[PDB]
Each structure stands twice: as C-alpha cells, then as structure tokens.
Amino acid sequence: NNAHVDNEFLILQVNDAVFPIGSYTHSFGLETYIQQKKVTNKESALEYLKANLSSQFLYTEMLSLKLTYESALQQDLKKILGVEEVIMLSTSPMELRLANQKLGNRFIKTLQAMNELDMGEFFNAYAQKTKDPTHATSYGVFAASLGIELKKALRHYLYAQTSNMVINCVKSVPLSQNDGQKILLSLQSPFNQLIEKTLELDESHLCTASVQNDIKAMQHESLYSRLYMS
Template identity: 45%
Template sequence: MNFLLLQINDALFPIGNYTHSFGLESYVQLGKIKNKYEARDYLKAYLHTQVLYTDLLAIKLIIESHCLEEILEIESIIAAASVARQIRSAIQKLGARFIKTIDAMKLKESALFQSYTQASVHHIYAVAYGVFCTSYQLNDEECIKQYLYAQASHTLTNCVKLIPLAQSDGQEILASLHEELHILYQELKNLTKQDLCNNAIASEIKAMQHQYLPTRLYMS
C-alpha cells in the first residue's frame, strides 16, 4: 500500500473539491434527481462518461506516454472540449491547487513533474494527477483505481448534501457500485486517444445552466 497515493486521493487533501458539483446541483434543483435510486443512476452514468472518457483516459494515456509534448497535447484537448465555462474553470483551479499542495509537501523533485508545471498553461487536475503519479513511479493500476473511487465518493457526498439523503443511503449506493468500478477499469483498458473527451452532452448543458441558477451552494 502506498501512503502517498492514499494521501493525494484523500477527501481532505486541500484542493477545493468540495466546492464543485460539476453540474450535479443543476440536476437536483431542476428536479431530475430526487432520491437514492436516481442518485445511483446519475453516479453510474457520470462515472461511465465524464470520469471514464476524460479523467481516467487522460491518466492512462499519460502513464503510457512519459512524453511532455504528448501530455500537453492531451491537456489541450481536454481544455478545448470543456465547453462549460464553470467546468473549465473548476478543473483548472483544482489542478493549480493540487500542484501548489504537492509543492508544499517538499517531496523529492521530479524532472517530468517540474517540466510539466512550468510548461503547462492549463494545469488541469486529472492531467496534473497523472503526471505526478507517473513521475513518482506510483503503481499504475492503483493510481487509476484510487482516483476512480475518490471521484465516486466525492460525487456521492455531493448527492447526499444536495438531495438530501441519509449518510447510510450514500454508503449503500457506494457499496452497490464496487463491481461497477471494476467494470469501468476493464473498459478503460480498451480505450485509446481517439476516445478522449467522448462525454455526455447533457452533463455539459447542466453545467452551463448552473451559472444561471438563482441560488447555488457550489461553484460549478
């Protein structure tokens, strides 16, 4: 077990994840998600689209690449494909905070990670995470699986707050999706760069609508 990997995926790792719902708040306020069953359906769909085809695939491609030029190209594709302004801003803010927090940890310097932080103009979170993991030679499979679990847990926490649900309902949903997380990891193995950012349009639309909600708890 790698404690560094656990630390950077911990819910308390201070990158500001708790301030973003990535469009979920729009679904709830518009009455699309009202109970634990609809929350489970939403989470499953979110993991199979945005998380799989953008975040996880980017991490996978970065781990396979080790090439700064290709890493920056992947990041540029994600930035261009992030149509909703709040989402684009969110993933960049999270990335910048991730890099700042890593720097504060005073780890042994990595040439690739340092080169990335200096050359990148976007600092997108999933990309920064992927570069960090490969730079510090963390286990490839565990890097992806722990990121996947962290995103599932974070999104579910937002569901519990927004709908709202009982904490026990949230844990029930998360436990019911354990096998689904394994399936997602297997699906990821067959994806290539051509699949990058093959996202759900509905999520993008809800993210755009979020900035016009009369009241908001989250920044995205």
C-alpha cells in the first residue's frame, strides 16, 4: 500500500540528524585525526572532509549504496548479499566495520518498528536474509523499494553523513558553528562531483582501498581518551 506514506517526507525523516540509529556516537576515524593534530582548524577540517569523502565514503558507502539500489530494482537479492559480504571482508579496521554494521542493523530495526510503514515484499525478504547490512547498503534497498530516484537518495544520504562529520569537527576540534556552515557551503560542488562520479563507477571499484584513513581508524582502538565509538 503506502497511499498515505509520502516519500518526500520519508526521505527527510530517515536522514534527519535525530533518526535514532546512533550516528552521533561515531567519528569513523576523525577523532584519531583530531587527537593527532592533523585536523586543527577550519582549513584542515575541510581538507580532511574532501579527502575522506573522495576515498572511503565514495568507493565504499556511495558506491555500495548505488549497487544495492540497482540490484533491488531487478529484485536481485543474491547480488545484494554478495556486495555486503565483500564489504565485510574488505573492511579491516574493526571499529569502522562494527560501526557500519551497527548503523545498518539499527536502520532496518527502526524501519520495522514503524508498523504503519509498508516497505514492500522485496525489502521484507532482504531484511530477513541479510547477515551484515550497512547503513549504506540497507538504505540503497530502502530507497529502491520505495521508488525514490537514485540521485535524490544519494544527495540526502551524502549531506546527512557529511553534516554529522562537520558537527563532530565543530565539537571536537573545536570550531565555531559558522565555520561549520562555511564548510558545508564549500562542500556543495564536491558533493555534486561525488554524485556524478558515483554514477559512473562500476562494482570493480567497490571498496577501493584507503590508506591513512584505514590506519587512523585502526589506531582509534588504542586511544586512551575517546569520546566516540569509532
């Protein structure tokens, strides 16, 4: 059904900074960068965000989101589970792997907790079989199941995740709130180029290795003083 469920509002709801999946408790390695004084001001914060988005977030998060989306459109569950397996086996930094899986779990459990939302037959099937969903893969299936246009789904997902990272820099560096806004504004052109790029890439690029990012994510496990789960 879903005669009363409006995708225009649902897309805002699931990307809301207060959608209860616990994003705010994760830095995905950023905290390590900050504590080691690689991100110390507005400028370095901006370089990091560009460096991270164009690496880890592009070839793992956005690309995977697109893959499970496209597969969902062809009701190709096997391919979707294959993508999720690759990610799990490709993500060496434990806290990074755990964080993504936790967020994946909570994303789906939050959707299912809304009894009046009917995700359809394919999403239910996917929700039943999935072993290691990530926030990005499950979102991909979610979006496709509801007929949400890919670029739109990518835009909302991309902005939300980046907003969370910017707010972390603001809290942790720290930075002024206006600095956060300048940064988010500066990121708009890159945002669009990442979406453009995402649409071009095929699965051969899935989980393209990052280097220092992986290292700092691993190093986060050893931080004596840590405010984040990753």
